[PDB]
Amino acid sequence: QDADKLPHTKVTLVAPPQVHPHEQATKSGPKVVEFTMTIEEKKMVIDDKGTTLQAMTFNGSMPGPTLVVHEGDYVQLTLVNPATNAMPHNVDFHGATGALGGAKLTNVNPGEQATLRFKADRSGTFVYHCAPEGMVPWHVVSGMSGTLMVLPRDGLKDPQGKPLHYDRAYTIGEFDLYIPKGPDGKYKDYATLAESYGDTVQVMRTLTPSHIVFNGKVGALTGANALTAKVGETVLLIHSQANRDTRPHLIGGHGDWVWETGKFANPPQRDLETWFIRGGSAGAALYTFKQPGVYAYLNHNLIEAFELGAAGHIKVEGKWNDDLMKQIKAPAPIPR
Amino acid sequence: QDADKLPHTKVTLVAPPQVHPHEQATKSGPKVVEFTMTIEEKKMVIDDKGTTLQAMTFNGSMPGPTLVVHEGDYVQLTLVNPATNAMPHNVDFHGATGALGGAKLTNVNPGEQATLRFKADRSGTFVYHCAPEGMVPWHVVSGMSGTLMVLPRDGLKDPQGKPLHYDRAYTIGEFDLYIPKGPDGKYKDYATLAESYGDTVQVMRTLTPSHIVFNGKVGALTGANALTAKVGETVLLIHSQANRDTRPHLIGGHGDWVWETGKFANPPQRDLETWFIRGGSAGAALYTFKQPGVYAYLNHNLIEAFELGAAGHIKVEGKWNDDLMKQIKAPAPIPR
Amino acid sequence: QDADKLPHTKVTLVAPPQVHPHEQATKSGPKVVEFTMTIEEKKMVIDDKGTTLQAMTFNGSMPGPTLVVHEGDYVQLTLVNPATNAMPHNVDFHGATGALGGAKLTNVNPGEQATLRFKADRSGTFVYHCAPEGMVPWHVVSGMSGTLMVLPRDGLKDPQGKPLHYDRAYTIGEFDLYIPKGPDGKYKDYATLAESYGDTVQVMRTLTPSHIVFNGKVGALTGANALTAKVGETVLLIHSQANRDTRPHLIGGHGDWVWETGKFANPPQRDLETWFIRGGSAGAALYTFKQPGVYAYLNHNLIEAFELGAAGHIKVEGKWNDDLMKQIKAPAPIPR
Ligand SMILES: [Cu+2]
Ligand SMILES: [Cu+2]
Ligand SMILES: [Cu+2]
Ligand SMILES: [Cu+2]
Ligand SMILES: [Cu+2]
Ligand SMILES: [Cu+2]
């Protein structure tokens, strides 16, 4: 179990909402899993009115990509901060032990890179986020967070120890955004990242987000970009919130098996209508679709979902089952 | 188990805080339970200063009435929207599967009605709420929500599988309200429901309620309208919050057995001082009274309870037990 | 089990963050444990800018001291309100049964004292707080709350019934503060406690704290006042929040065994990154340190932690373990 003598394997990361290919239950022994992530500071358009955010990301997306390893594996991450960026960054893994999650050992200025290795000895979905001394909240609410999933070597289990399996995994990062308004009542547009700082911290301190979005913008997971599934498929929905609480719900469905605190050595809860993700954590739910159609996946503070942006769609193909739900009489005039 | 061949039975709904008569454990097989609810848009007075709310309700109350069925039963609901109302409505049951909880099949304009049937295959307390496309948060925060309780056919159980029984059930709906203030610092009064919309959404977006009430108004469950019980009785307290988190507490008592996520196939937690209801869900607690007197049942964000309104009373008759609590020395001058 | 015939023992209270000496598992039978607490109204400096709070405390600290007894013991408290104070006070124990937690029997005006006895028949960490009729939220957010810990007579256990033991216990009270600003944008300073009332309630009603602190001020548990431990030691972290939700996290560590609702008859959850304390409750976590260094213990709403004050430090001595975490390559220029 000395990591220097284990087999090493490189994994290619994919952009949310997909998750890189991985095995659930595995016969493989422990290994050193190597990943590389590059920081990108960039301006992004977050709604249909043209509102912009001076964003900071891991690998160009919000959230950063999901990393998947098995319990007892070592994670080896190379963190690159290109010279085209303006600020220093680092990474704190909530799945790791010591040195402020790894943040003390990964301080990289623009033009530098560093490599960290840590043992992933606890199963579950964990947040990772950037945390530079003196500017922690700003880097996190500007987009620097993602999930590390550490699967039990034997896969997921129910409370009686029966195996659970998913057909597809999706990863959703929910972001509370603090975009300042000018004297004319319109959102401000900044030429540089540094220029947004002073106005943004003043808004953060009100604790009232201007927008709350899934994966980087209002409507990111709707219409053409909806998540997809089929009746009969079991989906794993991973949900991270690195700063603020949220309460996910699947309209028309349920959480069949849910780990709301996200830690797989604890028994899941079943049949949840709405679950709770604590700010600074990632949770996970399993659901097996039984009806076709469009489902909305949202934060069930409905103002936060419909007014501020935290809602997405899942489009499901299959046959309608009238034994679970049936329209007996369609809307018609009240009988007189 | 084809619903078309099961026995059908009509149930008469009662107004909160009571719950219609029902059996806990039942020897009866599955059935189609028929209910009817009528929407009522009306102006209501929500405090002792004369503040009004342009409200929207199921069956004229906030919350709407609690529906009770057993796991494996079918719910058959007729939803009526009279021609005296101005808006279109529908219903989303979190206990149902498919078609956005039933909302896609129950879109009724003023002057129409529709009938839906769904299988209640998961036990627990669930929220039901209205959710018309494009105006979801407004209909919900204006009062359109209630609870569906699906009891296990064998009744409630503790974590070791021992039977739990309640003598009385009460249902409390907690509502975060967003009442606009005019230029003179007083709450606005609207002539019609439609006229309140524009000002109300602006307040909703601040995420700061003006009032937070139990069952429709400040002081609804106090004084003459307090809930009642006797020492030795076991009470079931159902608590729904369709939009915002809340944290119920019984001053002078406890949650003996609590399902805070409200789903009865999971083991309850015991001896809770304060529990948590996620916005968009209903939970349930059991308590057996051991001391007489007045108890306060409230949201333990104390500003939310005492300043904004989320507090009620339970008045309990019986004999005082000095073995559980005794005043050794009543307040008196410090001895010099 | 008649309390009048049990042995009586007086306990000397210590100031947070320490907890008075006590046994975990005990062979001792039930007893009457006597404690005395004196109220102190005083002005305190809560940050490094000179901001003051007109505070109200149990025994001169925020939070008040932690009381520790074993399940089946009786608590006997003498509450003293000196004639140098201006307001009436009382105490509500969430661990007690009846008379609004004891508040109805402990109403003491300045110059008076009272003595209450109650049976501590439920294990767990409970909040105690002051609750004078008509001014409940103000006394609580001004500092009047603390924790009562009722240990199982057999000590703490894991979900399989295996014994858990801690080497040291620390107690942290988190306070949301509502300090008013004047017309010049600076925080107001009041000559008396009574003069702060009117402005303070107006700020409370916005539900937006100006500051959120651990143990009475920004930086209370940092630098020279950091908590301390050694690699290999198991620490018990008690966290109370009598009014508002919070989500504790140990950067670089985990919650090995956590009772987030704080009630020890329920099984703990393991491997948590971040846990949740409901406003109006106290929870508890155990952690065994495996790496030396500075750890930050904070509310993982990072704005609340770094901007508003809710963060502390734990300084741990010992040897670094490169098998759990290793810097493979220190920050260096990207290779060209
Ligand atoms: Cu950064
Ligand atoms: Cu963190
Ligand atoms: Cu409606
Ligand atoms: Cu809903
Ligand atoms: Cu007081
Ligand atoms: Cu209390």
Approach to solving: X-ray
- Cα distances (Å, whole numbers) of residue C71 to B124, C262, C317: 32, 14, 35
Q: How far apart are CA C215 and CA C212, in angstroms?
A: 10
Q: Which two tokens stand for residue C135?
A: 């001014």
Centre a 10 Å sphere on the Cβ of residue A84 and count the other Cβ atoms it contains: 11
C56 carries an active-site annotation: no
The DSSP bridge partners found for residue A165 are none
Diameter over CA atoms, chain A: 83
Tell me how many residue pairs between chain B and chain C have CB atoms under 8 A apart. 164
Closest CA to C219 of C315, C316, C314, C310: C310
Cis peptide before A267 (omega within 30 of 0): no
| Exposure on the CB side of residue A172, measured as CA atoms within 13 A | 33
Task: Write out chain C residues lying below 8 Å of B294, CB-based.
Answer: 100
Which amino acid is located at A257 in the chain? W
The DSSP bridge partners found for residue A171 are A238
Q: How far apart are CA C132 and CA A50, in angstroms?
A: 52
Q: How far apart are CA C307 and CA C263, in angstroms?
A: 31
Q: Which two tokens stand for residue B99?
A: 């078609």
For A329: left if phi > 0, alpha if psi spans -120 to 50, otherwise beta; the answer is: beta
- Cα distances (Å, whole numbers) of residue C40 to C43, C240, C242: 10, 20, 18
- Placement of tokens 């603090």 in the chain: A178
The DSSP bridge partners found for residue A249 are A274, A298
Is-contact C324 A128, C-beta < 8 A?
Answer: no
The DSSP bridge partners found for residue B235 are B168, B287
Q: How far apart are CA C190 and CA C180, in angstroms?
A: 10
Q: C267 φ, ψ to 5°?
A: -70, 140
* Sign of the dihedral through C-alpha A51, A54, A59, A60: positive
A20 carries an active-site annotation: no
How is A49-113 classified by DSSP, letter by letter?
Answer: T--EEEEEEETTBSSPPPEEEETTPEEEEEEEE-TT--S-B--EETTS-SGGGGGGG--B-TTEE
In 3-state terms, what secondary structure has residue A194?
helix
- Cα distances (Å, whole numbers) of residue B181 to B51, B143, B188: 10, 19, 5
Q: How far apart are CA C180 and CA C189, in angstroms?
A: 9
Cβ-based burial of A113 (10 A; exposed 0-12, middle 13-18, buried ≥19): buried
Q: What is the helix (H) or strand (E) element at residue A202, kind and residue range?
A: helix A193-204
Cβ-based burial of A251 (10 A; exposed 0-12, middle 13-18, buried ≥19): buried
In 3-state terms, what secondary structure has residue A227?
strand
Q: How far apart are CA B83 and CA B108, in angstroms?
A: 11
Cis peptide before C63 (omega within 30 of 0): yes
* Sign of the dihedral through C-alpha C312, C315, C316, C321: positive
**Per-residue DSSP letter, B104:** G
Q: Give CA B200 to chain center in angstroms.
A: 23
Could you say which of C23, C121, C133, C273 is catalytic? C273
Q: How far apart are CA C272 and CA C257, in angstroms?
A: 8
First-to-last alpha carbon distance for chain C, in angstroms, is 79
Which amino acid is located at C176 in the chain? D
Centre a 10 Å sphere on the Cβ of residue A60 and count the other Cβ atoms it contains: 16
Closest CA to B212 of B61, B47, B48: B47
The DSSP bridge partners found for residue C93 are C128
Total count of residues recorded for chain A: 336
Residues 6+ apart with CB under 8 A from B162: none
For chain B, helix, strand, coil in percent to 5 are: 10, 40, 45
Q: Give CA A303 to chain center in angstroms.
A: 21
- Placement of tokens 């013991």 in the chain: C73
Locate all alpha helices (DSSP H) within chain C, ordered by sequence. 136-141, 193-204, 302
Q: How far apart are CA B306 and CA C135, in angstroms?
A: 9
Picking from B108, B205, B281, the nearest residue to A274 by CB comes out as B281
Centre a 10 Å sphere on the Cβ of residue B16 and count the other Cβ atoms it contains: 25
Residues 6+ apart with CB under 8 A from B133: none
Q: Which two tokens stand for residue B119?
A: 């299988």
Is-contact A282 A238, C-beta < 8 A?
Answer: yes
Picking from B293, B303, B328, the nearest residue to C137 by CB comes out as B303
Is-contact B285 B255, C-beta < 8 A?
Answer: yes
Q: Which two tokens stand for residue B266?
A: 């999971």
In 3-state terms, what secondary structure has residue B224?
helix
Ranges for all domains in chain B classified under CATH 2.60.40.420? 2-152, 153-319
Q: How far apart are CA B24 and CA B154, in angstroms?
A: 7
First-to-last alpha carbon distance for chain A, in angstroms, is 79
Is-contact A281 A261, C-beta < 8 A?
Answer: yes
Which amino acid is located at A180 in the chain? P
**Per-residue DSSP letter, A126:** E
Picking from C274, C291, C296, the nearest residue to A98 by CB comes out as C291
Q: What is the helix (H) or strand (E) element at residue B311, kind and residue range?
A: strand B311-317
Is-contact A140 A128, C-beta < 8 A?
Answer: no
The DSSP bridge partners found for residue C311 are C298
Q: Which two tokens stand for residue C173?
A: 């009270």
Closest CA to C154 of C164, C145, C146, C144: C164
In 3-state terms, what secondary structure has residue C193?
helix
Q: How far apart are CA A199 and CA A192, in angstroms?
A: 13
How is B230-266 classified by DSSP, letter by letter?
Answer: ETT-EEEEEEEESSS-B-EEEET--EEEEETT--TTS
Q: How far apart are CA A286 and CA A236, in angstroms?
A: 5
**Contact residues, chain A to chain B, C-beta under 8 Å:** 208, 245, 247, 249, 251-254, 269-276, 290-291, 293-296, 300-308, 320-321, 323-334
How is C282-333 classified by DSSP, letter by letter?
Answer: EEEEEEE--S-EEEEEEESSHIIIIIT--EEEEEEES---TTTEEEEEEEEE
Picking from B252, B274, B293, the nearest residue to C278 by CB comes out as B274
Is-contact B285 B238, C-beta < 8 A?
Answer: no
B256 carries an active-site annotation: no
Is-contact B218 B161, C-beta < 8 A?
Answer: no
Q: How far apart are CA A278 and CA C246, in angstroms?
A: 9
| Exposure on the CB side of residue B87, measured as CA atoms within 13 A | 26
Which amino acid is located at B228 in the chain? T
The DSSP bridge partners found for residue B277 are B246
Q: Which two tokens stand for residue C96?
A: 């007690």
Q: Which two tokens stand for residue C76?
A: 């006997």
* β-bridge pairing A52-58 and B269-272: unpaired
Probe site for chain A from B38, B263, B276 (most A CB atoms < 10 A): B263
* β-bridge pairing A67-70 and A145-151: parallel
User: Which three-class secondary structure string do you get for B121-184?
Assistant: CCCEEEEEECCCCCCHHHHHHCCCEEEEEEECCCCEECCCCCEECCCEEEEEEEEEECCCECCC
CATH assignment of A153-319, among 3.40.50.2300, 3.50.50.60, 2.60.40.420, 3.40.1710.10: 2.60.40.420
Q: How far apart are CA C115 and CA C287, in angstroms?
A: 37
In 3-state terms, what secondary structure has residue C260?
coil
Q: How far apart are CA B326 and CA C118, in angstroms?
A: 6
In 3-state terms, what secondary structure has residue B254?
coil
First-to-last alpha carbon distance for chain B, in angstroms, is 79
Centre a 10 Å sphere on the Cβ of residue B256 and count the other Cβ atoms it contains: 19
Which amino acid is located at B5 in the chain? K
Angle (nearest 5°) at CA A168 between A166 and A172: 110
For B59: left if phi > 0, alpha if psi spans -120 to 50, otherwise beta; the answer is: left
Residue C245's closest chain B neighbor by CA?
B301
Which amino acid is located at C234 in the chain? T
Q: How far apart are CA C154 and CA C141, in angstroms?
A: 35
Q: Which two tokens stand for residue A321?
A: 């089952």
Q: Which two tokens stand for residue C254?
A: 């985990």
User: Is B158 labeled as ligand-binding?
Assistant: no
Under CATH, to which class is C2-152 assigned?
mainly beta
Q: How far apart are CA B149 and CA C107, in angstroms?
A: 41
* β-bridge pairing A234-241 and A269-272: unpaired
Rg (CA), chain C: 21
Q: Which two tokens stand for residue B325?
A: 């609590």
- Per-residue b or e along C66-81, where b marks 16 or more CB atoms closer than 10 Å to that residue's CB: bbbbbbbbbbbbbbbb
Cβ-based burial of C153 (10 A; exposed 0-12, middle 13-18, buried ≥19): middle
Is-contact C187 C179, C-beta < 8 A?
Answer: yes
Which amino acid is located at C240 in the chain? S
Separation of CA A242 and ligand 2 centre (Å): 7
Q: How far is B134 from chain A (nearest CA, A)?
A: 8
Closest CA to C266 of C158, C134, C127: C158
In this structure, what is the dihedral angle of CA atoms C204, C210, C216, C219, given to the nearest 10 degrees?
170
Closest CA to B264 of C286, A271, A94: A271
- Cα distances (Å, whole numbers) of residue A59 to A56, A90, A93, A120: 10, 13, 16, 22
Q: How far is B165 from chain A (nearest CA, A)?
A: 22
The DSSP bridge partners found for residue B61 are B58
Is-contact B276 B263, C-beta < 8 A?
Answer: no
Is-contact A327 B116, C-beta < 8 A?
Answer: yes
Is-contact B268 B220, C-beta < 8 A?
Answer: no
Q: How far apart are CA A299 and CA A174, in angstroms?
A: 9
Closest CA to A329 of B58, B11, B78, B129: B78
Breaks (C-N over 2.5 A) in chain A follow: none
Q: How far apart are CA C160 and CA C194, in angstroms?
A: 53
Task: Write out chain C residues lying below 8 Å of B296, CB-based.
Answer: 100
Ligand that comes closest to the CA of residue B242: 4
* β-bridge pairing A67-70 and A52-58: unpaired
Residues 6+ apart with CB under 8 A from C309: C47, C211, C212, C213, C214, C217, C218, C219
